[PDB]
Amino acid sequence: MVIPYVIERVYDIYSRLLKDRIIFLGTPIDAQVANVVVAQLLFLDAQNPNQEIKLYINSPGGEVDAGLAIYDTMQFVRAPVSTIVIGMAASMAAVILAAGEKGRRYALPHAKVMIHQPWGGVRGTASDIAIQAQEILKAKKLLNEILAKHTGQPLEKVEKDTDRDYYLSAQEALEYGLIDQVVTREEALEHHHHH
Amino acid sequence: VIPYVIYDIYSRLLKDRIIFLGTPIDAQVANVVVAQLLFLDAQNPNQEIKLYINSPGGEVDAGLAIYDTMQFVRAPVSTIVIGMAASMAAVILAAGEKGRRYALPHAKVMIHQPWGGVRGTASDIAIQAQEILKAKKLLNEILAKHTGQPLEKVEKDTDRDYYLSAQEALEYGLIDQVVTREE
Amino acid sequence: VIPYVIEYDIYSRLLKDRIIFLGTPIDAQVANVVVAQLLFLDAQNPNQEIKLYINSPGGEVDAGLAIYDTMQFVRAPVSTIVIGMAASMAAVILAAGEKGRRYALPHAKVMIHQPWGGVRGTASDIAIQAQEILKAKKLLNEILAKHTGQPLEKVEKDTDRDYYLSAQEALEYGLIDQVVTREE
Amino acid sequence: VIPYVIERVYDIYSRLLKDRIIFLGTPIDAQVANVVVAQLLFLDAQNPNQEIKLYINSPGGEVDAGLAIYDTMQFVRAPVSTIVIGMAASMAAVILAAGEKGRRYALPHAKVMIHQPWGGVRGTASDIAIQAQEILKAKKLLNEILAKHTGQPLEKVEKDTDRDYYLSAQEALEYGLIDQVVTREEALE
Amino acid sequence: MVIPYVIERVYDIYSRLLKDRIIFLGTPIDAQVANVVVAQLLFLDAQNPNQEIKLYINSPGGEVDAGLAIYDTMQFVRAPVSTIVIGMAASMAAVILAAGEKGRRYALPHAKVMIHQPWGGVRGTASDIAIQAQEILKAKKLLNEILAKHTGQPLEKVEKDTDRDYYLSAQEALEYGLIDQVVTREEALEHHHHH
Amino acid sequence: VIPYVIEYDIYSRLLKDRIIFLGTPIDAQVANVVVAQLLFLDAQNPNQEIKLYINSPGGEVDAGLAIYDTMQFVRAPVSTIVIGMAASMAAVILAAGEKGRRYALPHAKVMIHQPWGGVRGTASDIAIQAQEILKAKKLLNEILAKHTGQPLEKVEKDTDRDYYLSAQEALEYGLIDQVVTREE
Amino acid sequence: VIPYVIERVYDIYSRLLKDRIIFLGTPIDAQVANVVVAQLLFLDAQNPNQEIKLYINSPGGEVDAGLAIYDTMQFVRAPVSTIVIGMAASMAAVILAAGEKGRRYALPHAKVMIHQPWGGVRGTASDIAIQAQEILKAKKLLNEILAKHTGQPLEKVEKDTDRDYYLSAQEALEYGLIDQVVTREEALE
Amino acid sequence: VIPYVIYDIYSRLLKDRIIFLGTPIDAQVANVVVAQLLFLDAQNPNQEIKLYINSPGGEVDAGLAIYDTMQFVRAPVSTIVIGMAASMAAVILAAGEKGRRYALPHAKVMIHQPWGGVRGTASDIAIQAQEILKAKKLLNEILAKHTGQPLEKVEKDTDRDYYLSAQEALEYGLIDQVVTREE
Amino acid sequence: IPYVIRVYDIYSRLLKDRIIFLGTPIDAQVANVVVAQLLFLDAQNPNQEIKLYINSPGGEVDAGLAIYDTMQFVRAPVSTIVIGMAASMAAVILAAGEKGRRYALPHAKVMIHQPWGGVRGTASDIAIQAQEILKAKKLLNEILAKHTGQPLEKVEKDTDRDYYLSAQEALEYGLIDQVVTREEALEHHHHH
Numbered sequence A, E: 001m002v003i004p005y006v007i008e009r010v011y012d013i014y015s016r017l018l019k020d021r022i023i024f025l026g027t028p029i030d031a032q033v034a035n036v037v038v039a040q041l042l043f044l045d046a047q048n049p050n051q052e053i054k055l056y057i058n059s060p061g062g063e064v065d066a067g068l069a070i071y072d073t074m075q076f077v078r079a080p081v082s083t084i085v086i087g088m089a090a091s092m093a094a095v096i097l098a099a100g101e102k103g104r105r106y107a108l109p110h111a112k113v114m115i116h117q118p119w120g121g122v123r124g125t126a127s128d129i130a131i132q133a134q135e136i137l138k139a140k141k142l143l144n145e146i147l148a149k150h151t152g153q154p155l156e157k158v159e160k161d162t163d164r165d166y167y168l169s170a171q172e173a174l175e176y177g178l179i180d181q182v183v184t185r186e187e188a189l190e191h192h193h194h195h
Numbered sequence B, H: 001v002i003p004y005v006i007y008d009i010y011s012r013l014l015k016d017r018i019i020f021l022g023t024p025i026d027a028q029v030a031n032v033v034v035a036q037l038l039f040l041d042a043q044n045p046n047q048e049i050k051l052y053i054n055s056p057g058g059e060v061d062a063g064l065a066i067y068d069t070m071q072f073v074r075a076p077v078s079t080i081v082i083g084m085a086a087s088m089a090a091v092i093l094a095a096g097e098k099g100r101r102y103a104l105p106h107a108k109v110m111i112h113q114p115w116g117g118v119r120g121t122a123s124d125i126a127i128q129a130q131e132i133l134k135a136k137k138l139l140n141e142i143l144a145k146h147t148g149q150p151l152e153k154v155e156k157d158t159d160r161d162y163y164l165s166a167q168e169a170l171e172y173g174l175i176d177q178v179v180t181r182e183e
Numbered sequence C, F: 001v002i003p004y005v006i007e008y009d010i011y012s013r014l015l016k017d018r019i020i021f022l023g024t025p026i027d028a029q030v031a032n033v034v035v036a037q038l039l040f041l042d043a044q045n046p047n048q049e050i051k052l053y054i055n056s057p058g059g060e061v062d063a064g065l066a067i068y069d070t071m072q073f074v075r076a077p078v079s080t081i082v083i084g085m086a087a088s089m090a091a092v093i094l095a096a097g098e099k100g101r102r103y104a105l106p107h108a109k110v111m112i113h114q115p116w117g118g119v120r121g122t123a124s125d126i127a128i129q130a131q132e133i134l135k136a137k138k139l140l141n142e143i144l145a146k147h148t149g150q151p152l153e154k155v156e157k158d159t160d161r162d163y164y165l166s167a168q169e170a171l172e173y174g175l176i177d178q179v180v181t182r183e184e
Numbered sequence D, G: 001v002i003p004y005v006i007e008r009v010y011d012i013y014s015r016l017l018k019d020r021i022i023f024l025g026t027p028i029d030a031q032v033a034n035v036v037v038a039q040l041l042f043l044d045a046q047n048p049n050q051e052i053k054l055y056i057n058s059p060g061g062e063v064d065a066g067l068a069i070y071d072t073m074q075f076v077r078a079p080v081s082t083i084v085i086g087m088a089a090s091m092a093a094v095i096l097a098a099g100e101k102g103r104r105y106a107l108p109h110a111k112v113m114i115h116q117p118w119g120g121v122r123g124t125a126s127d128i129a130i131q132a133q134e135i136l137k138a139k140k141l142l143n144e145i146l147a148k149h150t151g152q153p154l155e156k157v158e159k160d161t162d163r164d165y166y167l168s169a170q171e172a173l174e175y176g177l178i179d180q181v182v183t184r185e186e187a188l189e
Numbered sequence I: 001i002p003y004v005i006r007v008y009d010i011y012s013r014l015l016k017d018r019i020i021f022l023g024t025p026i027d028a029q030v031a032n033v034v035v036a037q038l039l040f041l042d043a044q045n046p047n048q049e050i051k052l053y054i055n056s057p058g059g060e061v062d063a064g065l066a067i068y069d070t071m072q073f074v075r076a077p078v079s080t081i082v083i084g085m086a087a088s089m090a091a092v093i094l095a096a097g098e099k100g101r102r103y104a105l106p107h108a109k110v111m112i113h114q115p116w117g118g119v120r121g122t123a124s125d126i127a128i129q130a131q132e133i134l135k136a137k138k139l140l141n142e143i144l145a146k147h148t149g150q151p152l153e154k155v156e157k158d159t160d161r162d163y164y165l166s167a168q169e170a171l172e173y174g175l176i177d178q179v180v181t182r183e184e185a186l187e188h189h190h191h192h
């Protein structure tokens, strides 16, 4: 990772966009990356609980527990976080996208969203498998409910849709409720009348 | 490795209607045990077959194959545990012809619930979780039938590893005699 | 370690008795050797029955169909007996024994599901290999429907994920004809 | 890759340390216990009366290293509020439960899991006997620590921890592991 | 490979069916398996140049040079060789199937045939690559011609068809000319009138 | 070994001059860092041009589109310059610079072709992933047609296999606007 | 897995040896040279006047081992007919070309390929110089052996073998490597 | 590894308009050489850039990148081979500003045709075979332009490895002076 | 490596004092960084001496010659000092310091021998590289003869196998000029 630098002020490129209240979620999600995203949110909200945070998303997903950490921290924090999917937002990364501030969830034109039920693995004795099987079942229902809340769709629809991989174009993601605008071009700064 | 007689040593004891189950149990060894039974019963459906057991267990499906074939075959099979009979190998021991299930003095029996592993999606895990649950209850029931113990007891005993001396295996019902000399 | 008997190894001796074992996962090499035993046993006597004991988790559809097609083609009727496990293609081979001569032991299982596989290549190449897997899926659903008697719309929905059957459940599904406990 | 902030350039975790925030987000081994312990000691030396927030996302780890973190929280004057985000399991559950009473928090979809210790020993029979006894004490010791800090009868924690025992955040409230399920930032009541 | 045995006569199962003039081509084709197939043909033709040889085929293909060895030996040998594809006959194995004695090329119902152009690889200098590139080009045209001969199809059709993987059902293989009969059931021995 | 200059490393200093390098194969991590540099350079001045030097063999379509979509979205016009090699997604990024501001050096190349990939799973799962690759294929053919001016039926037949273009050939195909030899 | 035939059970290659057939179907290293040489010596001891058929499918190998096979064919009284099925390259081409004149045969789609030797040397400068000289002799030696047995001028084989030179069976006829392209079994003319 | 001055040693010689090409050439090193040229020419398009060469060669595409950038940039680049300049690195040497291409006495130049590798189907190999053929002719032409030799000669010389002493490189046209002391 | 504070690592600080270390085996990347330090030190001041401490087992001839050619080319005189070991190309670099300013410590060694290498390829390709190694052999024998004063057939017969020299033996052979044991005392001088 040969990330570039910018300028008595030396940042790397992601650290400089952090000073502009931009966070990148660009890797698969495991505990380590959840923690560092959570920590950036906590810091940006402490800096100013009223300004918006932009969270750019390019991720294939990851661990439900780490994803929920990011989710719960977005809801908890006072600052509203606008999610923007560039390229790919799948599995837990779709959920994080859908859970931005309503009205400020954006996709670029050729970005995608994909959703599906969780997957995992257990080894152990029958008693041990039974316990973990029950745990994965709760996560499944829990994540279906979180999706239904934030898209507006009836829950038996998300359950049916996520049974296998469900790929959405950005427009299809609009029509599904996962985002609010498909953004193509950056508009001009605008003037206003003071009557 | 194995010595010869004028057969190899296990093949010669097969002409004396002796079968060895001395390895861990996977499909390949189940098949070859099943096949020896089928052959020995075709040779003579009334004579006894001795099945010497030294095994730590194995796959439930392969073990049941051996079990189902012992019950199905007309010849009565006497099970003898020398050294170790654990997990599915305990079940096979317990399912010899009642009255001719034998242990040597320092042999052991160990029983416990099944273990396994599943990868896949939530739907896929749910299915295999269900399957392991049936095998658990099924094997507890098979044990209760052949020892005489109440089923609530085998379920609580097999929750973790349950080691039995040969005498303790007598009192539990897994065998019929602790054999020391050759009468 | 397979044992010997005075003339054979144990599987070769039960072959004299017209017994064939399908006890491994199915790949081309084991299909060929099963096919070859059938061809030989039918040449030796096209009217006597062949017993095919099944303990297998399945395998490649192409190799499995080889075994299937050879059972239908050969004049001798082949009784399938599942001991322990018959899954995926091995379930199909079980179901395709001579009607009335398909047997399970009490604690044996059957499992059925749709095929799985993998393709690496360009988009054109994947499209071709995707179409091929789709035909195999429909083809195997149809073969199952014919030999169990079930409506095809049912096998397709049942095989969407792993579908485990006890031997009794296999009897009511049509995959076998008798759950055999004793020697009768 | 951790980002930086600004005659002062910190990395993001080091900056939240100036705000008396510590992260326990990895599995617990001696190396991470030591660095958590050291941050506590420093934060208490800077001001023994202000609170320390300890964010927890960890699957657990070695009992000895975990106890190090535990013992240091009790010993230090400053009260440490534990907050589980995502996951707190095994020793990490214990550390969660041992925050200042009333200041132990979970986010809504976070989890707690508890169970007895696991380990391994090679050696001769004499050697195995010794470390078998050691694991037995740790089991009894950790059950007691849990009972103290949740309020549950000890016969209950021993039965509950016999296998993996997963708790939702609400279930963790009811069990006594935490004090509030916090959904929004206003914890200024 | 735990192949079984049969009976002062001890054979393994493939060696016994060889005494019945049956040869198996069941593995991918490399020089080693070409040689052993070639050798069985030479022996069976020396035993009796007029009786038929049955060649059962279940193979995904292999090296063109080794395949041609099998092909050239079938044509050269006086005995007619009936090819039977059970399961799969692809690439060079399709060619070997198609080159059985016309009228005695058989498929089982669910067997397949697949054909396509050759593939390979070369490392070396530009001069060296040019040489091997020319070699692969001849093999391509050569194998297209061999297919056209033995199916009856116009050559620009086989060239077009083999550009990518071309899968054929057994019926489709009949209609293409690669085989002569789709064989399902073994018929009874039959009686004949002596008028 | 990247060298430093008195305040930066060499790529970070040319970033001050609104130069971005896309010199590796394209995966999500390099897409993100290119996207981020664009966003920063456009925030610094939405009217000045950004030069994007390209030496890349291509990469993942999703990451490439990220770079593409960000170039179109950002107000500043981005001049693409291929030095050495621009293939697969890197060709697309080249072709999508500001019309009239797409340049090749004399011996640079462009190569285009359809996507490739791989899927492992059940038949249902493969069908889904096969449909996805098919959309990407058509989508990328359309993006190429828009930015070169060629009829779509032509890009589809040209990209069926590897299609190598010299810089001049790239000029007559529409992928670039000038073959630049000197400094002018 | 090679099959068997029958108070006599041979494997298939051993049975065709009783018919004075030898297979050279692998790459050539010392081990396979020795076993080919040994079969020749045995077949010539059984009957020095009958022909030996040597079927060739090989990509070549070590010059020293190949020459062993070559020298043994010339030395032995019995005439050895070489038949290339599939492939005969490098040393295997040389062995093909050195069958009894008039009894060197190719099947229609078989190939011949010829080229100069390749190898490798590590060591000091003195050591490299020595084995460089050795490879140079082998090059010149093998070019001469080819010229003898094809009839071509030596300046031509040297230029032709500078890189890989692939020949169809017909092209091999025209070049002198073989005597007949045999399509059908009747070679009884 | 590399020492520091109060910059690291290569970065300090960059402020003296010196660039090192000391590794084998792949896309990553082409890019960083190209970038240094672009920067040095932006600093001052009239001053010379010295490019010290010790490299065994590399990928043609990356090499051409370096070549095309030297021609394109206004500043004249003097190439100096110390030790070794082979394959693409020879081409880059030969393409310095005519008259300021230098070798040290015991440095070498080696030239030859490209090498590579292709996997794939026959159609795919045909395409990449064609590509390597163009690169071969293209690089022979670039050599002929910058040495002055007839093209038939570079094609026959580069058929295998062609090693040149620095003097032999002078007479061939690849350089302009064999430099021994620092005048 | 330790640090000293302007801040430097220990080798970078001794570079300030016009000291260069050649302490690893010689491959292209270490040749380049040695060459670059020379070029910089000579640009700093073409008249002051550069000390080059040598502890190396040798390396690639091409990279070594790079270091050699750069020492001759550069105006500043470079004193070579072998501490511990100077073998193969590293011996050559030692011998090619400014005559009279080539030094060994008492228990240091010099070893010389002919080049070694390896080639894989076709006969034509091997012939070409074989010729190349032969030139390097003679070229390096000549460079040694030039800088020691020995007759060339002597270096050729001596370098046929490994030829180890003590520092004294290296003096008598011509590879160095002084065996230095104690840093010469700092003294007070008469100014009449």
Ligand SMILES: *[B]([O])([O])[C]([C][C]([C])[C])[N]C(=O)[C]([C]C1=[C][C]=[C][C]=[C]1)[N]C(=O)C1=[C]N=[C][C]=N1
Residues within 6 Å of the ligand: A060, A061, A062, A063, A064, A065, A090, A091, A092, A093, A095, A116, A117, A118, A119, A120, A121, A135, A136, A139, A143
């Ligand atoms: B996803 O594909 O990103 C998905 C999220 C959910 C919204 C459908 N993730 C999972 O299902 C993960 C997969 C995984 C990734 C890496 C390591 C291990 C597992 N599964 C879990 O997080 C999980 C949950 N409960 C139990 C076990 N595993």
Ligand SMILES: *[B]([O])([O])[C]([C][C]([C])[C])[N]C(=O)[C]([C]C1=[C][C]=[C][C]=[C]1)[N]C(=O)C1=[C]N=[C][C]=N1
Residues within 6 Å of the ligand: B056, B057, B058, B059, B060, B061, B086, B087, B088, B089, B091, B112, B113, B114, B115, B116, B117, B131, B132, B135, B139
């Ligand atoms: B034992 O330990 O041998 C035991 C049998 C006992 C319950 C009567 N065996 C199992 O539990 C096996 C263990 C195993 C062996 C080899 C590979 C994998 C697992 N389990 C199963 O066979 C099984 C059954 N149903 C589902 C999954 N696994």
Ligand SMILES: *[B]([O])([O])[C]([C][C]([C])[C])[N]C(=O)[C]([C]C1=[C][C]=[C][C]=[C]1)[N]C(=O)C1=[C]N=[C][C]=N1
Residues within 6 Å of the ligand: C057, C058, C059, C060, C061, C062, C087, C088, C089, C090, C092, C113, C114, C115, C116, C117, C118, C132, C133, C136, C140
């Ligand atoms: B089963 O799991 O045994 C199943 C058969 C079922 C549908 C009747 N087999 C397959 O799905 C096999 C699995 C496999 C085995 C070995 C290598 C790869 C895959 N799949 C195929 O045979 C197959 C066929 N065509 C395309 C891809 N895969």
Ligand SMILES: *[B]([O])([O])[C]([C][C]([C])[C])[N]C(=O)[C]([C]C1=[C][C]=[C][C]=[C]1)[N]C(=O)C1=[C]N=[C][C]=N1
Residues within 6 Å of the ligand: D059, D060, D061, D062, D063, D064, D089, D090, D091, D092, D094, D115, D116, D117, D118, D119, D120, D134, D135, D138, D142
């Ligand atoms: B948990 O899974 O995080 C758990 C904590 C306890 C409260 C149940 N950890 C342990 O039990 C650890 C696991 C371990 C981690 C890494 C290496 C080895 C073991 N066990 C121990 O710390 C331990 C204690 N006594 C003896 C041996 N091991």
Ligand SMILES: *[B]([O])([O])[C]([C][C]([C])[C])[N]C(=O)[C]([C]C1=[C][C]=[C][C]=[C]1)[N]C(=O)C1=[C]N=[C][C]=N1
Residues within 6 Å of the ligand: E060, E061, E062, E063, E064, E065, E090, E091, E092, E093, E095, E116, E117, E118, E119, E120, E121, E135, E136, E139, E143
């Ligand atoms: B096939 O897929 O079986 C095919 C045969 C032809 C009828 C289309 N085989 C090949 O293309 C082989 C592939 C191969 C397999 C194993 C190792 C190496 C290559 N290619 C060749 O035989 C070949 C031909 N000429 C040059 C290089 N390789």
Ligand SMILES: *[B]([O])([O])[C]([C][C]([C])[C])[N]C(=O)[C]([C]C1=[C][C]=[C][C]=[C]1)[N]C(=O)C1=[C]N=[C][C]=N1
Residues within 6 Å of the ligand: F057, F058, F059, F060, F061, F062, F087, F088, F089, F090, F092, F113, F114, F115, F116, F117, F118, F132, F133, F136, F140
């Ligand atoms: B190219 O070769 O760079 C090409 C883009 C072209 C069509 C404009 N890229 C792909 O085809 C990539 C290659 C790849 C890179 C890394 C891992 C796997 C594959 N394919 C995909 O991005 C892709 C997308 N959807 C499904 C499968 N593969």
Ligand SMILES: *[B]([O])([O])[C]([C][C]([C])[C])[N]C(=O)[C]([C]C1=[C][C]=[C][C]=[C]1)[N]C(=O)C1=[C]N=[C][C]=N1
Residues within 6 Å of the ligand: G059, G060, G061, G062, G063, G064, G089, G090, G091, G092, G094, G115, G116, G117, G118, G119, G120, G134, G135, G138, G142
């Ligand atoms: B050919 O490629 O089969 C060829 C034969 C010759 C007529 C051109 N073989 C060789 O050149 C062999 C190749 C080799 C094979 C295995 C290990 C090492 C080399 N070379 C030699 O036999 C050889 C001869 N002299 C010196 C070194 N190597």
Ligand SMILES: *[B]([O])([O])[C]([C][C]([C])[C])[N]C(=O)[C]([C]C1=[C][C]=[C][C]=[C]1)[N]C(=O)C1=[C]N=[C][C]=N1
Residues within 6 Å of the ligand: H056, H057, H058, H059, H060, H061, H086, H087, H088, H089, H091, H112, H113, H114, H115, H116, H117, H131, H132, H135, H139
């Ligand atoms: B040389 O050896 O450095 C040489 C350049 C010379 C002809 C001016 N390089 C090549 O021939 C490279 C070799 C290579 C290096 C690294 C990986 C793979 C190959 N060849 C190519 O760059 C190339 C060009 N077109 C097609 C294939 N390969």
Ligand SMILES: *[B]([O])([O])[C]([C][C]([C])[C])[N]C(=O)[C]([C]C1=[C][C]=[C][C]=[C]1)[N]C(=O)C1=[C]N=[C][C]=N1
Residues within 6 Å of the ligand: I057, I058, I059, I060, I061, I062, I087, I088, I089, I090, I092, I113, I114, I115, I116, I117, I118, I132, I133, I136, I140
């Ligand atoms: B020595 O051991 O340092 C010696 C130098 C010379 C004074 C006798 N080195 C060599 O001979 C090197 C050895 C080597 C080192 C690292 C990789 C490969 C080889 N040989 C060459 O430099 C050489 C090899 N082939 C051709 C030209 N030069």
